[PDB]
Amino acid sequence: INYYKDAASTSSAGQSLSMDPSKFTEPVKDLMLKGAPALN
Protein backbone atom coordinates (compact mmCIF):
# COMPACT_ATOMS: atom_id res chain seq x y z
CA ILE A 1 0.00 0.00 0.00
CA ASN A 2 1.52 3.34 -0.96
CA TYR A 3 0.43 6.01 1.55
CA TYR A 4 1.95 8.80 -0.46
CA LYS A 5 1.25 10.33 -3.81
CA ASP A 6 4.67 10.70 -5.40
CA ALA A 7 6.77 7.84 -6.76
CA ALA A 8 9.94 8.92 -5.01
CA SER A 9 8.28 8.20 -1.79
CA THR A 10 7.92 4.47 -2.27
CA SER A 11 10.30 1.95 -0.77
CA SER A 12 13.26 0.29 -2.42
CA ALA A 13 12.84 -1.32 -5.79
CA GLY A 14 12.78 -5.21 -5.95
CA GLN A 15 15.45 -7.36 -7.67
CA SER A 16 16.32 -6.66 -11.22
CA LEU A 17 16.59 -10.34 -11.63
CA SER A 18 17.97 -9.06 -14.96
CA MET A 19 21.59 -10.25 -15.09
CA ASP A 20 23.41 -10.47 -18.41
CA PRO A 21 27.15 -10.26 -18.20
CA SER A 22 27.71 -10.63 -21.91
CA LYS A 23 27.83 -6.89 -22.57
CA PHE A 24 30.91 -6.89 -20.29
CA THR A 25 32.36 -10.39 -20.77
CA GLU A 26 31.89 -10.95 -24.49
CA PRO A 27 31.58 -7.67 -26.35
CA VAL A 28 33.25 -9.22 -29.45
CA LYS A 29 31.93 -8.43 -32.92
CA ASP A 30 32.12 -11.99 -34.33
CA LEU A 31 30.72 -14.52 -31.90
CA MET A 32 33.14 -16.87 -30.20
CA LEU A 33 32.06 -20.46 -29.44
CA LYS A 34 33.65 -22.15 -26.44
CA GLY A 35 35.52 -25.21 -27.74
CA ALA A 36 36.01 -23.85 -31.20
CA PRO A 37 39.44 -22.30 -31.76
CA ALA A 38 39.77 -18.67 -30.64
CA LEU A 39 41.64 -17.58 -33.76
CA ASN A 40 40.91 -19.38 -37.01
Partner 1 sequence: GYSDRVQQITLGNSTITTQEAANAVVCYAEWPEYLPDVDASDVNKTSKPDTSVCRFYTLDSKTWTTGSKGWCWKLPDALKDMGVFGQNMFFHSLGRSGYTVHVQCNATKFHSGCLLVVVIPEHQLASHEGGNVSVKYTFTHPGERGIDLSSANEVGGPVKDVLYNMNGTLLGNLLIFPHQFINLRTNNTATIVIPYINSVPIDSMTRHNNVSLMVIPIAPLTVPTGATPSLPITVTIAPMCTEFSGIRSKSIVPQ
Partner 2 sequence: TVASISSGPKHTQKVPILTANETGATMPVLPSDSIETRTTYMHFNGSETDVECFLGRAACVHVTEIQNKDATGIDNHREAKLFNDWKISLSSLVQLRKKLELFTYVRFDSEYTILATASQPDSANYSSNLVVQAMYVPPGAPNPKEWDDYTWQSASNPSVFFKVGDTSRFSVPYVGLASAYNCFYDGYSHDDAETQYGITVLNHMGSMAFRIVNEHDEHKTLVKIRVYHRAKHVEAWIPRAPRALPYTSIGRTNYPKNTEPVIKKRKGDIKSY
Q: Which is nearer to partner 1, 14 or 27 (CB)?
A: 27
CA atoms of 33 and 40, how far apart (whole Å):
12
Site mask for partner 2 (CB under 8 A), range 7-26, x = bound: xxxxxxxxxxx-x----xxx
**CA 25/CA 11 separation, integer angstroms:** 32
CB of 27 to partner 1, least distance (A): 5
Ranges of H-type helices in 1-40: 22-25
Specify whether the CB–CB gap between 8 and 1 falls below 8 A.
no
Nearest-approach distance from CB 37 to partner 2, in angstroms: 8
* Residue ranges in contact with partner 1 by CB under 8 A: 22-24, 26-30, 32, 36-40
